[PDB]
């Protein structure tokens, strides 16, 4: 299957009480491997996954070097935007940056990213052509201008179609056991009566990886979409994910309903039926 490497950056200004808080994390598919926290003691890029601890001091000194630069960068970004919108320096604001690359099953470049968001609204993003930008307002447009002269896109392109892909692949290899693993979900069904004329049907999908999944309920073959309780795929905390979907059923019809599970780690799609 295809894979990706993403870097999430969050900076929050805390006026009147120190320097803005900066958090940085990075992923390979759904596994986090490194992190950096401005409020932490180390003031260093730290590992968050086993398969990266191997990397020597060069890697850690380099990433600690780059990560700090990012922090400073978004520390300034807060300033700039604060002016781009004539905002009170009293209020706290947020800046989010997320860049990375995707590769197909062939481990070849498939598309890259580089997007921003100020206080939750899309600010500026790199288009697919990796050669142009999407400015939202006049502010983002002014930034787009700067990045156009500075020829930022071209540079970012090299990173995305090159270095980025190459590290993903490396990490993919060095982490074969984890990153390249798959765990078909462990599916089971629970039945608890709500009343003397109804029952709840819960379909479970546990300990699976990656997070991509499709858990569906069907009555006599028809999707019960709009009548299904579907929680967000959540993390077990052990590296695997969980998920469930439930429907309220008229006591006596449990057999009409079927749960359908779809996961990249299942030879064929699952079909469970209470009985």
């Amino acid at each position: 299957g295809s894979h990706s490497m993403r870097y999430f950056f969050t900076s929050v200004s805390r006026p009147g009480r120190g320097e803005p808080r900066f958090i940085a994390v990075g992923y390979v598919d759904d596994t986090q491997f490194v992190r950096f926290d401005s409020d932490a003691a180390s003031q260093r890029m730290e590992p968050r996954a086993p398969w990266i601890e191997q990397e020597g001091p060069e890697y850690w000194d380099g990433e600690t070097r780059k990560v700090k630069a990012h922090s400073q960068t978004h520390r300034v970004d807060l300033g700039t935007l604060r002016g781009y919108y004539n905002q009170s320096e009293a209020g706290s604001h947020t800046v989010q940056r997320m860049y990375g690359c995707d590769v197909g099953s062939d481990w070849r470049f498939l598309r890259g990213y580089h997007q921003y968001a100020y206080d939750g609204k899309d600010y500026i993003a790199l288009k697919e052509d990796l050669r142009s930008w999407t400015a939202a307002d006049m502010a983002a447009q002014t930034t787009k201008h700067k990045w156009e002269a500075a020829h930022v896109a071209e540079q970012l392109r090299a990173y995305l179609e090159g270095t980025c892909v190459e590290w993903l692949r490396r990490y993919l290899e060095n982490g074969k056991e984890t990153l390249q693993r798959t765990d078909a979900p462990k599916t089971h069904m629970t039945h608890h009566a709500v009343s003397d004329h109804e029952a709840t049907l819960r379909c479970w999908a546990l300990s699976f990886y990656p997070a991509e999944i499709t858990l569906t309920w069907q009555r006599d073959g028809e999707d019960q979409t709009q009548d299904t309780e579907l929680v967000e795929t959540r993390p077990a905390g052990d590296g695997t994910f969980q998920k469930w979907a439930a429907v309220v059923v008229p006591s006596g019809q449990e057999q009409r309903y079927t749960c359908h599970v779809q996961h990249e780690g299942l030879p064929k799609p699952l079909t469970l039926r209470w009985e």
Binding site: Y7, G26, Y59, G62, E63, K66, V67, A69, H70, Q72, T73, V76, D77, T80, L81, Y84, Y99, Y116, Y123, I124, T143, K146, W147, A150, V152, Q155, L156, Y159, T163, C164, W167
Partner: peptide, 9 residues
């Protein structure tokens, strides 16, 4: 590994 260039808004 992080990108080595550090653009500004």
């Amino acid at each position: 590994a992080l990108w080595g260039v550090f653009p500004v808004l």
